[PDB]
Inverse folding.
RNA sequence: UAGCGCCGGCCAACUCCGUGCCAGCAGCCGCGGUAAUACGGAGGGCGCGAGCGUUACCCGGAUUCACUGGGCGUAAAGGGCGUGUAGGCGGCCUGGGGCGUCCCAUGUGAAAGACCACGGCUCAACCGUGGGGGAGCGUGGGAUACGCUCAGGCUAGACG
RNA sequence: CCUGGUCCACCCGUGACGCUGAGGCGCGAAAGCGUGGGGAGCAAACCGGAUUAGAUACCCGGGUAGUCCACGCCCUAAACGAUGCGCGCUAGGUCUCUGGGUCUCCUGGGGGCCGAAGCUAACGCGUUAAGCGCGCCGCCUGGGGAGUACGGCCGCAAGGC
RNA sequence: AAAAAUGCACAAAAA
């Protein structure tokens, strides 16, 4: 299924902190502080001028790497975001962002999107009152996502919530923190969320 | 302020009794992404020099590129020798659809959204030279009316 | 002989301009006037005057151009850059209104005969007609 | 004063080249008599106006006109009349690049400077009996070509040519540089690669004296003061 | 449970060893003759992941059958030259008719499918409900510039 | 002697009677073929002498078809301007053939060079277009296999399409 | 207007 295993070797390969991990990527590792170079033997060698395709390849790889999503699923969305009444880059991002697993991390119920996914899929999340297991669920404006009552104790979440105080969620979102719930107000912009990604490149990549 | 991009570097050769002696061409684009671009073809005995005069010659040859919304006024086509470029404008949200040579040129001046096809000889030197003369002849309603008035 | 009197004229002009002649005559006709009518009205020519050469009716057409330019090759721009025949004797081109062209995203004109007379893409699309497409200019 | 009448003109100065004509030149030819194309002097003055005005405008606004001609007719009349306005000129073998390669050709002017530095001045005796004549010889040829060119270490805003055919290069050099081209045009060459046009006999030294004389005056009168007529009739047949 | 393909350029990913025009690779250009990023193992990287590869076939890139959108002096390409059958094309002016063309009106263009919305399965795939429409062809009403046809005039083509 | 095309001047007649042209038909260098004739010079084949390692060649001496005529076939070609035909449009310069004129000059139909614009991959072309356009015909679609095979049609054959 | 035939398979690099 979804990528398993060494994640900070991606942080490194792409050459930007993707924050695919939890807090550790905010500490002085991420792997990124110690060794800000690509993995394996050759990482400390002088780079060569990257190919035009290479450039688009990585940009796409990064963006995908971020939401930690399969190339199958990822391509769907991009084709979905193609036609597209839309500016097509943005549309793609909105959709990516609408993922229940993405939103849950965005709403800080969980620290890492990889942690978000197990959260959704173990029964520890609810959409509009309903239990929802599937990280790929597309949320739309007005949706109330919340920790299910069945386990609201769950040291992990309370820890993630009680520490979520001291934080302010993205504009398109809102979170009531004493109630273990939150709401999806709208679709995030290009502006609304800055990503390391150049979205104009991911499009040029599927131009093939 | 200005931005350089090289689309091509060639080693060519002449023959002397000795053997092959080489020389280097360099194709360079120059532009501010504000609607100014230029193209020049440098040749000297080593790469950097030839990339240097490439940039140099570039700036001494330029073009008015009448963008509107990051695209072009009308659909144009030009031929330079046997090479041909068709330039068609696009709505916003499209992107620049081009092969490496005309992409580079179209990018360094405006043009967030365009449609192109190369036809004929795809030789990049002559396709580049065909693109410049293609921008060069772009015209707007302004030029159009000021062209047909009288007096 | 002249298989295509219209296309001859259009070419007569194309050839005229590119040498920067002030004026050139074409063999005269009711149809060529109605076209040439549209050509001055849209600004591509100053216009024409019926004349006679060796007793024979002509249309002396007065060419239009740009300003003398700077740099080498001072020769002006062109009012008519491009003019080409479309529906021809060899193949006839008949477009319904919905199928009418837009030349250079509107900067150019497409002249076309319809049963409401000789019109333009704009002109024809408004009366709502379509018909035999004569040529395109810009 | 500034302008001129046809009286002195009409004698030697109307029409020159027989059938060697560039056809672009129609407008300025009236009829053909004597097998020789005859220039229409009415339309000369028509132009001689629009031109002179651009000169006078350029003079009283303080900018330069470069004088060129290589023919044996305009060779003398140019050296005089150009220094008379204190202007740059070429009467000798117009060099390639002299405009498009300017910063480079001019490094030969600076060399001319260094060569002047040694005439009677010291350090000249210190050079070998041989190398003397050699270095001096390079000055003497340097002198020949760069006399007129020496002035104006910057490229002009105009150039004035006698035969725009005889120096095409010159015109094209300027034309490439957006440098306005004024010249005294014959049937010999064509209009239209000339910006401001002076349409009359390119040969016939008599004709050259008349036009270039009062062409320099028009500049003097514009910049400040005036002067007496310049030397003309010395040889003159 | 994790596997598979690749890392000479095209094409994203490089180093050691072994081998020595051998064994072998190979989509095209091509690698291997004792230092091989191209063979084989390795470590290491790139890609995709319950899949990854291969073979076969279709379309695309191929304006490389060119209607859109090509060509024919020397690149493939003007018939050895005429005369002429059919067919194709056809100057200037005016009327008739309305065949082509053009406009409106209308019948038909099944359902499914596709496109656009909204919903139903925990999402999705699937699936439901509604919307959007041609083209063509029938009928009816009209238009007549152009092409046609029919009639009449012309001299600029062509013949005498 | 019979006979085709062609151009000029006059501006008289017909009134679009036009262009092109798949098939068809006809013409079609040389060589070749049949039946006669004719045969000097030339000369495939062939012989001889030189040369050479060889010399079934190049050079030399001979030399038969053939070359020539009539009739009848064959239908090919670097049959080339390697450039289909008709028309209109787009600077000039210069040489030349042949008409007409108010015979320096102007004008028309041919034949050559240089060249405007434009074209072209270049070389080049350029009012004798390879420019700008329209009509209609022929043809191209990687190299070899192969202008071969098969079939069909044609030829006396060679052989041709 | 020339006495005189022939030459071993595959093979770098000058980013
Ligand atoms: Mg439990
Ligand atoms: Mg071409
Ligand atoms: Mg290629
Ligand atoms: Mg010199
Ligand atoms: Mg692969
Ligand atoms: Mg690579
Ligand atoms: Mg070894
Ligand atoms: Mg080794
Ligand atoms: Mg080796
Ligand atoms: Mg290796
Ligand atoms: Mg490989
Ligand atoms: Mg290996
Ligand atoms: Mg195709
Ligand atoms: Mg076609
Ligand atoms: Mg082709
Ligand atoms: Mg050929
Ligand atoms: Mg032929
Ligand atoms: Mg017929
Ligand atoms: Mg007709
Ligand atoms: Mg009808
Ligand atoms: Mg249906
Ligand atoms: Mg739903
Ligand atoms: Mg439905
Ligand atoms: Mg009639
Ligand atoms: Mg006769
Ligand atoms: Mg008559
Ligand atoms: Mg009559
Ligand atoms: Mg024969
Ligand atoms: Mg014979
Ligand atoms: Mg025999
Ligand atoms: Mg015989
Ligand atoms: Mg016999
Ligand atoms: Mg005999
Ligand atoms: Mg013998
Ligand atoms: Mg022997
Ligand atoms: Mg013999
Ligand atoms: Mg003999
Ligand atoms: Mg034949
Ligand atoms: Mg042939
Ligand atoms: Mg002639
Ligand atoms: Mg030219
Ligand atoms: Mg084959
Ligand atoms: Mg044969
Ligand atoms: Mg057979
Ligand atoms: Mg044949
Ligand atoms: Mg041998
Ligand atoms: Mg060899
Ligand atoms: Mg080998
Ligand atoms: Zn990290």
């Amino acid at each position: 299924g979804r990528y398993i295993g060494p994640v900070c070797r991606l942080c490194r390969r792409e050459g930007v902190k993707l924050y695919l991990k939890g807090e550790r990527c905010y500490s002085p590792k991420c792997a990124m502080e110690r060794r800000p170079y690509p993995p394996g033997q050759h990482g400390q060698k002088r780079a060569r001028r990257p190919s035009d395709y290479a450039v688009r390849l990585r940009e796409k790889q990064k963006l995908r790497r971020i939401y930690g999503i399969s190339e199958r699923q990822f391509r769907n969305l991009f084709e979905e975001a193609s036609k597209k009444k839309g500016v097509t880059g943005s549309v793609f991002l909105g959709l990516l962002e609408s993922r229940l697993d993405n939103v849950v991390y965005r709403l800080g119920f969980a620290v890492s999107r990889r942690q978000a996914r197990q959260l959704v899929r173990h029964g520890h999340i609810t959409v509009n009152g309903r239990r929802v297991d599937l990280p790929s669920y597309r949320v739309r404006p007005g949706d109330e996502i919340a920790v299910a009552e069945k386990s609201r104790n769950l040291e992990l979440i309370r820890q993630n919530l009680e520490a979520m105080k001291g934080r302010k969620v993205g504009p398109w979102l809102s979170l009531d923190v004493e109630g273990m719930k939150g709401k999806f107000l709208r679709l995030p912009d290009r502006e609304d969320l800055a990503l390391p990604v150049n979205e104009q490149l991911v499009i040029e990549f599927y131009s093939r | 302020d200005f931005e350089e991009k090289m689309i091509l570097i060639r080693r060519t050769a002449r023959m002397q009794a000795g053997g092959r002696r080489f020389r280097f061409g360099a194709l360079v684009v120059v532009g501010d992404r504000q609607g100014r671009v230029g193209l020049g073809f440098g040749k000297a005995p080593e790469v950097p020099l030839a990339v240097q005069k490439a940039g140099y010659y570039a700036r001494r040859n330029m073009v008015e590129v009448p963008l509107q919304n990051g695209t072009i006024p009308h659909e144009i086509e030009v031929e330079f020798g046997a090479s041909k470029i068709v330039l068609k404008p696009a709505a916003p949200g499209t992107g620049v659809i081009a092969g490496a040579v005309p992409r580079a040129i179209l990018e360094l001046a405006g043009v967030t959204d365009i449609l192109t096809k190369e036809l004929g000889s795809r030789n990049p030197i002559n396709i580049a030279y065909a693109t410049m003369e293609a921008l060069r002849q772009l015209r707007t309603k302004a030029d159009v009316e000021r062209l047909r008035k009288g007096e | 002989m002249l298989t295509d009197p219209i296309a001859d004229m259009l070419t007569r002009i194309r050839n005229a301009t590119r040498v920067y002649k002030e004026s050139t005559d074409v063999p005269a006709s009711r149809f060529k006037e109605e076209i040439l009518r549209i050509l001055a009205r849209e600004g591509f020519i100053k216009g024409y005057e019926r004349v006679d050469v060796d007793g024979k009716p002509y249309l002396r057409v007065y060419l239009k151009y740009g300003p003398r330019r700077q740099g080498p090759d001072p020769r002006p721009e062109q009012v008519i850059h491009h003019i080409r025949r479309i529906s021809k004797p060899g193949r006839r081109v008949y477009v319904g209104v919905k199928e009418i062209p837009r030349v250079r995203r509107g900067l150019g004109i497409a002249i076309l005969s319809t049963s409401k007379g000789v019109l333009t893409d704009r002109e024809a699309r408004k009366l709502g007609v379509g018909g035999e497409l004569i040529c395109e200019v810009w | 004063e500034i302008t001129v009448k046809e009286l002195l003109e009409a004698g030697v100065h109307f029409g020159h080249e027989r059938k060697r004509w560039n056809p672009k030149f129609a407008r300025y030819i009236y009829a053909e008599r004597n097998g020789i194309h005859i220039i229409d002097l009415q339309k000369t003055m028509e132009e001689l106006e629009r031109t002179f005005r651009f000169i006078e405008d350029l003079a009283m606004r303080g900018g330069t006109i470069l004088f060129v001609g290589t023919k044996k007719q305009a060779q003398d009349i140019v050296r005089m009349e150009a220094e008379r306005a204190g202007m740059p000129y070429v009467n000798q073998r117009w060099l390639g690049g002299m405009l498009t390669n300017f910063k480079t050709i001019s490094q030969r002017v600076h060399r001319l400077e260094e060569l002047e530095a040694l005439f009677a001045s010291p350090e000249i005796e210190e050079r070998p009996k041989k190398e003397q004549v050699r270095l001096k010889h390079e000055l003497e040829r340097l002198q020949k070509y760069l006399s007129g060119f020496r002035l104006l270490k910057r490229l002009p805003d105009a150039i004035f040519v006698v035969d725009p055919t005889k120096e095409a290069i010159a015109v094209r050099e300027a034309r490439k540089l957006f440098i306005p081209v004024i010249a005294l045009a014959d049937t010999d060459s064509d209009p239209d690669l000339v910006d401001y046009i002076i349409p009359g006999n390119d040969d016939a030294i008599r004709s050259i004296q008349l036009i270039l004389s009062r062409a320099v005056d028009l500049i003097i009168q514009a910049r400040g003061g005036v002067v007496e007529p310049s030397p003309s009739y010395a040889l003159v047949q």
About this structure: The radius of gyration of chain B is 17 Å. The first strand of chain B starts at residue 3 and ends at 16. The interface with chain A takes residues 92-93, 95, 97, 100 of chain B (CB under 8 Å). Residues 64-149 of chain B form a domain with the Ribosomal Protein S5; domain 2 fold (CATH 3.30.230.10).
